[PDB]
């Protein structure tokens, strides 16, 4: 499902994959990349079957691409009625019946009805002369972009915060923004429960005040609760994400961690969306304290810098290193920098190693003379620009 | 003790001056306005004296004010060289023993160096091989320019926020901002009762987690604890506070806090520079998390508004109205105000009433077609000269 990557022959290894059949729709994608346009006049395609395995396999070649539905109680439904009531847009309850024969649902060939019931049980929505208007609720969900399920949940979580809150330590802020748990990667309980007593004084503060209990985590895993399981997740969730935050090096998360480099970026990439959601849904809500603290939360888990690189980062080819090297050379601001000494930034980006051999996202590999030149570029062209 | 006041005649009522004699070093200025330069060539003063306290008013009169002491363990001598030996220009305590030789103390005509044992106790400095360096703590209080008494009590109460903190209000971030009571007004127990009843569910909490008892508030003084008093009244302070920074009407205050306006400018200006060193504090003592929401609190506090007209109030005149009015105009940011047209501010200042009549501070009063003009006026050079 990725960028095209061609290819004279493409070979797959079993029909099955990962436990699973292949699906139809992924195999049209699956080789289409074979043949280059221009280069190579044929391209081919061998899937490698074993035993009865054949006869699965070939399901694949002649198979057809399974019809598109529209997957609309439903979750995915809720927030449609939702956007487009909280909006203005349409406001009479007729009006909204005819924007649900506009679906796709609609144009294929009950429930649309009964599901703004459901938005008026949880306060999305007040009920007036019938005509809707929006709530504070419910107006801070659409500009936030939250599905309509999970800020029932963030509401109260969010609100559970307003009571008790820690600061010394970027845990409790860092605890509201981790997303969920997906499947991101797979729990060791045993090397939690190492890391669980390791944990300084002030971070097991935080743990007792979001439900994680210090007497059951990784305890009774060991020796054998949805809601519970989905904090306890919650935690590793932030407390992985608070080293990354710490520009600890990405290796040493793989030996304390035991999550793969490549599951953390999915992360760190998926965590920074919801602190730029949650910070909205704070604004609109009129909580103008934590969208303080939430506010420099989504720049510092992009791109796993402290608040010392925020400014420094600013700049698109300073990702994690390229600005803390830069920043030990007395640049602290992306003001200065960018009357900086063209040949003074050669030297230092030359050192801390841990001719086009440097690399910047979207141009492929550059040489050092290029993108340090870059380096100051690039910040000339922001301090007037954005004034 | 103010600005310059001339007038011809000046009257004293009593030498006693509530309840206590009048001092002969403010005397010497109580008549010194009396004689104009140039227009009258007569200047008089009648102090007014009855029965036997003609002897005690007249002993001013052949009086001379008392000569200057020192005042120089000492409070006011611990941050003496505390400003010295953390700034790093005295380090040997040989050295810092012809610093007490350069003092007033010193030069009129022992426990200098039994005072510095005094800040080892407290942190504040390190003992090294003598020869001292400053601490973590000890740098910090240098920068904030607090007293290394009231720091030890504020570092414990600053880091007792990090136990447990609320954002919902804005009383917990005010209560530890609040300077102290002195003597800004008199208290009003009953007053505070009715007062204490009717605050919300919010704010009750904050109270609680400072020491402040609902048991007891108002309930034993009217029946009949130094750290436990200074308590209550910097509670009673943040109440006050917190109005403030609503932009309730000052006279409105009076009716509901029974303290005049005369002391509440007093104290949110005094509580102003508060803010502006607790900021600094935790500044330098490395907590990022409290220095983001002190930081807009140094500006709320001098000019008692909102969060909303903080970029508004840059300009020097609009001090808690003239920015209310402008922001309802579509005015909410100083950028483009500075664009915004000269006759349309005019007819929106004229409006809001609770030709030089319209006063701004510093240059007594203005019209209005001249102050509105200074409005955008100043607008215009805050643009650039801050870029």
Sequence with gaps: SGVNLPARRVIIRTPIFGGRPLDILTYKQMVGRAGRKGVDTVG??????????????????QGSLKPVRSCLVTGSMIRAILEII???????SQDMHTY???????????????????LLENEFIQSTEKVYHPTHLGSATLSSSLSPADTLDIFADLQRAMKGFVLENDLHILYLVTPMFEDWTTIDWYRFFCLWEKLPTSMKRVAELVGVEEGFLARCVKGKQHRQMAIHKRFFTSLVLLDLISEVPLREINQKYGCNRGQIQ??????????????????????????????????????????????????????????????ASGFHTVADLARANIVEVEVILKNAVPMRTIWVTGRKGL?????????????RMILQQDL
């Design 44 to 61: 081919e395609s061998i899937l490698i079957c074993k035993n009865s395995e054949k006869s699965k396999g070939i399901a694949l070649l």
């Design 86 to 92: 909280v909006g203005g847009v349409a406001s009479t």
């Design 100 to 118: 649900a024969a506009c679906t796709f649902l609609a144009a294929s060939m009950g429930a649309i009805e009964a599901c703004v019931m459901w």
């Design 266 to 327: 999915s992360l760190q990439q998926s965590a920074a969306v919801y602190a730029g959601m949650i910070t909205v849904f704070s604004n609109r809500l009129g909580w103008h304290n934590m969208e303080l603290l939430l506010s420099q939360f989504q720049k510092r888990l992009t791109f796993g810098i402290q608040r010392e690189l925020c400014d420094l980062v600013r700049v698109s080819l300073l990702n994690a290193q390229r600005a803390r090297v830069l920043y």
């Design 367 to 379: 040489t050092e003379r290029e993108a340090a030149a870059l380096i100051v570029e690039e910040a």
